[PDB]
Amino acid sequence: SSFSFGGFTFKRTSGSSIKREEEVLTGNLQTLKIRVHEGYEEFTMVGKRATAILRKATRRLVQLIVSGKDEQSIAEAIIVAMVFSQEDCMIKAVRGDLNFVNRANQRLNPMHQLLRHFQKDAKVLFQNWGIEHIDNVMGMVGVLPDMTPSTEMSMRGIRVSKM
Numbered sequence: 001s002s003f004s005f006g007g008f009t010f011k012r013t014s015g016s017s018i019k020r021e022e023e024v025l026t027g028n029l030q031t032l033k034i035r036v037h038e039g040y041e042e043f044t045m046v047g048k049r050a051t052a053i054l055r056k057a058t059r060r061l062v063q064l065i066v067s068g069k070d071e072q073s074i075a076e077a078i079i080v081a082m083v084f085s086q087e088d089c090m091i092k093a094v095r096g097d098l099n100f101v102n103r104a105n106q107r108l109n110p111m112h113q114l115l116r117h118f119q120k121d122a123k124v125l126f127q128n129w130g131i132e133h134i135d136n137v138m139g140m141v142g143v144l145p146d147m148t149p150s151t152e153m154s155m156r157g158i159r160v161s162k163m
């Protein structure tokens with residue numbers, strides 16, 4: 001079962017999941033109804049300018065190792081991964097003036113709306129995601145919320161691999 005999302009081709013390599021419709025609150029306290037995937041799964045993300053290994057559990061990104069053409073290409077893949085993960089901090093990063101998902105049309109997709117929102121500006125997403133101290137894994141680097149490489153700190157779960 002291969003599928004497309006945010007310009008990437010996803011392929012499940014391990015795990016299984018069941019769907020459950022859930023109501024989540026944004027940072028604006030707005031209710032969104034999302035189709036939540038329950039279960040630990042592993043995927044490959046293949047795009048035109050980036051590729052990744054994604055390890056996720058229910059509404060939680062465990063790890064993402066990204067490889068792409070440059071900073072912008074890698075950032076695009078990170079954004080899709082965070083939205084795909086269905087995490088609460090990704091959902092809570094939706095806040096402020098006019099930052100509302102059009103829900104008067106039930107047939108619309110909140111996942112695509114969240115994607116479009118973070119594609120325009122990932123600064124609140126990347127800042128609100130969290131940062132962790134990383135080990136000295138050679139070949140893989142950490143990446144800070146401004147997409148600066150760091151050998152000591154990175155965005156929680158995120159590693160950059162060389163091409």
Ligand SMILES: O=C(N[C@@H]1CCC[C@H](Nc2nc(-c3c(CO)[nH]c4ncc(F)cc34)ncc2F)C1)N1CCCC1
Nearest residue numbers: 003005012017035037041084085086107108109111112
């Ligand atoms: O729910 C909607 N869009 C979704 C956007 C994300 C990908 C999703 N499609 C698909 N998602 C998945 C999927 C799996 C399968 O292992 N795990 C997931 N975990 C999180 C997630 F957001 C989607 C998944 N497996 C196969 C798919 F074709 C469709 N829509 C589109 C219009 C009607 C509602």
